[PDB]
Design a protein around this nucleic acid. Structure first.
Lengths: 79, 64, 50, 48
RNA sequence: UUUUGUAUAAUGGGUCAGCGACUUAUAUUCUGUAGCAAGGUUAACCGAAUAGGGGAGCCGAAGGGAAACCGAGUCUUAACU
RNA sequence: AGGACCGAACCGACUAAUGUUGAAAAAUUAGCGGAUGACUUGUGGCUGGGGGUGAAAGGCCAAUCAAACCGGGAGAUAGCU
RNA sequence: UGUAACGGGGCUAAACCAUGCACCGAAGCUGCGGCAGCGACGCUUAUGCGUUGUUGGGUAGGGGAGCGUUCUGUAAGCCUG
RNA sequence: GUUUAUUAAAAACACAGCACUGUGCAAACACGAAAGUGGACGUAUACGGUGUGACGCCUGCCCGGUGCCGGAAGGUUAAU
RNA sequence: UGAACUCGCUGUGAAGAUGCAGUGUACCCGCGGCAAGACGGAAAGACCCCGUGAACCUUUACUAUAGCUUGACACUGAACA
RNA sequence: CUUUAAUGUUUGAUGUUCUAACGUUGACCCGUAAUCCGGGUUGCGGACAGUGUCUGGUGGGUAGUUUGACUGGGGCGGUCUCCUCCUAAAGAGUAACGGAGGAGCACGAAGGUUGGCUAAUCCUGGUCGGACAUCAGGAGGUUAGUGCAAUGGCAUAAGCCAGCUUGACUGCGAGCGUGACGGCGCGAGCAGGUGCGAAAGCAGGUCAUAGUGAUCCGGUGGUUCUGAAUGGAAGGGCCAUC
């Protein structure tokens, strides 16, 4: 394989930054190989098989500096 | 000379009243067991061209 | 296609087969896998791949 | 169909056959046609 | 004329006077305007003749569906959804 | 007796000066190879462009050659000056 | 290759460093004459006058609008021995 | 001797002699909508064709690979 | 053969300028010669490279065929080993 | 059901012989005291040959055509689609023939669901024991492990272990993420039915990302949508597939 081969981009993005928006549902996060390093609060679910922090009700994103470790809380609630 | 409808488009599309062309779409003829079940449940219903994707198609289909 | 695909019929044999990703190339094992028969819309036993 | 490369779009898509051949022998009328007809009966018998 | 850049020992000028290189129909989409408008238009052709006549055909006015089949509705199917 | 052999014409165009919009589509000058022969030359004719003719050179074929001349297909074709 | 590693002279201060006030310094700023466009304020609705404000170098391409040239009609007219 | 018209004039090409594979005569060989004609008015001591190279005297090895001849022992096997 | 009444050095430089900047020099026009220049005048570089271009040549690469050949067939009848 | 001969016989081949098919590079006569040629008379060959024709084989002798791209030039080597980390700039967009490892498949479990558990490594003790394996104790550890590369998570484990078990589900889908598009990735939830759990509750596989060719063609199995005069049929369309 490499060098080079490089493994170009790997589809890696940050997506959810600041208050954000969605019509009725939203992803909350997209960052891969992530389970509980960003923890679920409000109208969402914890990250697993698809790496998203998916929210089933229209909400605005709120970010905490602390959680159970590490494991900082990412809150999604209606405004 | 009377201007010809292109065979490449004429035998692949169905017309409408409001505009846009209706068609069966690809990926539903060849080796079905190897393809995803959710994908096969999404390709079973037929597809359509909307007015924003239509200019390229009437450049092959001139007539009513 | 190096997968030699198998197709089974329901307990009653009626309608079409059920095509499955279950392999026969690599291991001899039980072919009964219990699947949906859409003439009865019920989960039933499936038989004979020939 | 040419768009610089990567093939014309219609060459990716499946064919549609099975013709019906009745439209060229079918008429379409609104309620204000054949509406008087000298008091007679509307039937498609022997139009020639 | 060209080029990142040419006074360029780069391609081109000896001179007077002339020559020397872009058509519109069939089909169509949007635009402009003209006649008429849910209608508009006849082709070839007849004709006193460029008047009048010629609506076959064409486009538009109602769609959905592989098609059969339904219609301001309609397809998909066990399908209400 | 002899494709012996010297030497002109006769057939060539090897040496050096010269010419190459020339005396010239290759000869002006003096030499040089062959010089009754597998020689040359006057007259008449035969073999024809995917076809001839070469002790046969990718030589020659009427100013034209890894393929002659003419008009027509023809305003071939040119992602280019 | 020859004045030729401030272009050169002057200059042991007329160089070097930074300091204090003055002056010179564009086609622009700014004043005026003129024009087109956008918009106000005062007077007036042939429609202008008065004042203030403001934009006006534009090439691949996208829009607006004149002056000549020729034919055809005007032209049974108008100019001409 | 022959020679590449105007850039090598020869170690290039050509006759000698040798070898080999074909060819029984309506030969093999050759050009041709095909007669016909050339081979030849010739006869295997003749003729075709490819090598090598006058002369004197000579010419070691390999048949697995390539081609060709007979078989297809053994394989693979068309048409109809 | 655009305009020519075409000096040397050094700088500037599509950087190897007669011609832009500075500086040293130079009577004008001929003629018979001299020959360091005017990248002299001649050749819309020949060199090499790029090109899915064109051609020729290698060849059981792809495709078609002349000729060869088993079979089927027409001229076509009868017998025996 | 063997291997084979003769009696009978189907169909070929080689050879001989006859000649009511066809050849004569045989002669003579007439045209005509014509070494062209036809006719005429007579000999010799003979289904061999000859000429054309169709299907298979062979066959540059002849004619047309093809022979991908990158490569800080050519050439040996590297490379063209898919995974992963740094280069990569503390939004967005991202390069090199820069630094460095992999894929073109496997698994019926390493799965679903309910209930339990926790590593590495080193020393000492111990033995069928010239060196691995299983263990006991002590120090020490979310550093072991995960079907495979790499990457990060992972104990409330997604790492291994037992019961039951196959959701490695059908039909639908609001949509959510992405690239210029084709196309790629993720999917709430509804409806059908089965499975786990005492139950609240949960299951559209695997710890996630690579494991694969758009379409045209024809085949394969159902249907009764179509089907040139029309009742069947051929062929197509749908349904289900290769």
């Amino acid at each position: 394989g490499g060098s080079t081969r490089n493994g170009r981009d790997s589809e890696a993005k940050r997506l959810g930054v600041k208050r954000f928006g969605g019509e009725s549902v939203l992803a909350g996060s997209i960052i891969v190989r992530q389970r509980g390093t960003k923890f679920h609060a409000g109208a969402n679910v914890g990250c697993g098989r698809d790496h998203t922090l998916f929210a089933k009700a229209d909400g605005k994103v709120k970010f905490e500096v602390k959680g159970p470790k590490n494991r900082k809380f990412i809150s999604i609630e209606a405004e | 000379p009377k201007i010809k409808t292109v065979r490449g488009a004429a035998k692949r599309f169905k017309k409408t009243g409001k505009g846009g062309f209706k068609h069966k779409h690809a990926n539903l003829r060849h080796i079905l067991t190897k393809k995803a079940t959710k994908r096969k449940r999404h390709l079973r219903p037929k597809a359509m061209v909307s007015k924003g994707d239509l200019g390229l198609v009437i450049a092959c289909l001139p007539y009513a | 296609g190096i997968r030699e695909k198998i197709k089974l019929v329901s307990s009653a044999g009626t309608g079409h087969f059920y095509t499955t990703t279950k392999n026969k190339r690599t291991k001899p094992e039980k072919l009964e896998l219990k699947k949906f028969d859409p003439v009865v819309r019920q989960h039933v036993i499936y038989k004979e791949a020939k | 169909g040419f768009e610089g490369g990567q093939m014309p779009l219609y060459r990716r898509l499946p064919k549609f056959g099975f013709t019906s051949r009745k439209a060229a022998i079918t008429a379409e009328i609104r309620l204000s046609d054949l509406a008087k007809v000298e008091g007679g009966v509307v039937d498609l018998n022997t139009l020639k």
